[PDB]
Amino acid sequence: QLNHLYGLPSHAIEALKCVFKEYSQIDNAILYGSRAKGTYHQGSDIDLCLTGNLLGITELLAIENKIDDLLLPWKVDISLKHTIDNPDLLEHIERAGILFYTKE
Amino acid sequence: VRWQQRLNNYARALQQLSLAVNLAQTRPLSDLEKQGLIQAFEFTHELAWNVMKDYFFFQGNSAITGSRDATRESFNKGLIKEGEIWMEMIKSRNQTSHTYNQSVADEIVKNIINFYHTSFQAFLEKMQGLK
Amino acid sequence: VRWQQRLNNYARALQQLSLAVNLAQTRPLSDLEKQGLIQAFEFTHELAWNVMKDYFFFQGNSAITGSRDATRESFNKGLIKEGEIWMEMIKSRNQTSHTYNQSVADEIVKNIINFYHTSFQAFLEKMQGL
């Protein structure tokens, strides 16, 4: 109930940022979907898109396994940017996507 | 049908757990009674997440395997409202073997009395309304 | 709107399913091809019932918890006219883990070819008409 952004508590956002910090191949991560539009309900998914060039499906599935181990209640749909060929999905990410994490 | 029998067994288990919790909210429990409360929470939560799994299979979702998947899907589909509490329930389950250290047992008992019982009752009311 | 994007993805999946079906109607399929047809059907049905869920959420309905509730509400609301075939779709989905038994796989592909594909096309037309 006590949220920070996107209807999520601060510690959840930071825990995900933590898992992304383990991967130097992640240039950034963009939040899209309902939590980026404000049209989210309590148990809504967390839709994230990892922008990175050195990221393969191997790292993709490893990150998903790490996220799962965080034991968060929300589901996380993670996807690599350069692996998407759905024009509609791309349009939505570039129009309504919020910068969720940045590598520094 | 299957998830409705699991829900009846869950209701019985939650009756027992509610007796235990209500005893805890009126007077401090001994170590043995704390361990018994932990055991009651354990079998109640087992029944609960199996109820979620059965219900979602009945809905056409056969991808759920364990308590994690069941809990997350229940949170996403509105069966439960406080997901973090159910994830902590799972974490408590994972600590069952270390309840002989009184610190772990006390923490789990606090969680059972202050949070898990309300969530179990809410889940029982929700599922019963979907029969 | 969410249900319209879901409907676009569902149209893509149903087009792939239509390719697989037209192949099945041109010549017999190997066992591997039957497994692939089952997979395409699963993609299509998942996307279809999620389209239904999204559309009803646009109507102020949050009580859709899965494919069964979505199908029942689609029948009650007129989105689909033969709820029995969609209940059979749910049965086929729940049989997915046993398709190594080739009788189960054969039953599922039979249902896909003879019934499910047409219902998917009609559902696509209906949702495009809303």
Add this chain to the structure above:
Amino acid sequence: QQRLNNYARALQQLSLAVNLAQTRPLSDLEKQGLIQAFEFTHELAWNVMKDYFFFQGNSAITGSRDATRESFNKGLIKEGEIWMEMIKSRNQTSHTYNQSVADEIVKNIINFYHTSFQAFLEKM
């Protein structure tokens, strides 16, 4: 072994609950507590067996059944039937909300399991 210490503590707490059971009737919550005591005590015990056999160059122990059978074959336990029944009780834990299952488990705990646990501690 370091795990033998924790086993001794868990067994001490289990003994307290058993000694209490002999003097007066236990309530349902206390019966469930005794079941949980047996739970963590037996977990500690069979993991003790596993560690002891691993130190002897035997990483082929995959669970409590393998450890129990190996110990029975090495005289670490004298009545392997009691430990097989213990394994049986462990698997009935989710069903202790049924009064019959709980009473069966509790009876087995008080009559046989406690003595076996104590004898096993003595040997280790």
Add this chain to the structure above:
Amino acid sequence: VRWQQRLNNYARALQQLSLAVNLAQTRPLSDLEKQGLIQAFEFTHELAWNVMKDYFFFQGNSAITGSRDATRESFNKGLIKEGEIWMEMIKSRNQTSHTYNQSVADEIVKNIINFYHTSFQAFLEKMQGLKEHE
């Protein structure tokens, strides 16, 4: 006792998967055959992790709930060696329910042919060796 029947079913599923993987070794596969290959891996892995659960229940461990707990316990107790590969299997399942991605689809097929099949066969050889009767 129950894990042995499960193991037999797993052997049959693996046979079907082996036929597909060996076919892919002789020639490329069509998109339909690739989806069939994924389907074969899915019902092979579903049976595989249920064999782990059933066996550990036989051993007296009734704490395992899902494929995650079952894979972790299998690696810990020595039933499998490539723990990470089996964890990758888990996140490769149920891609029917997670939108669709062609590139991802192709990478799972590559992982099935180059790693998963071998892990399945080794797991079958280990479990069959642990069987003593029936």
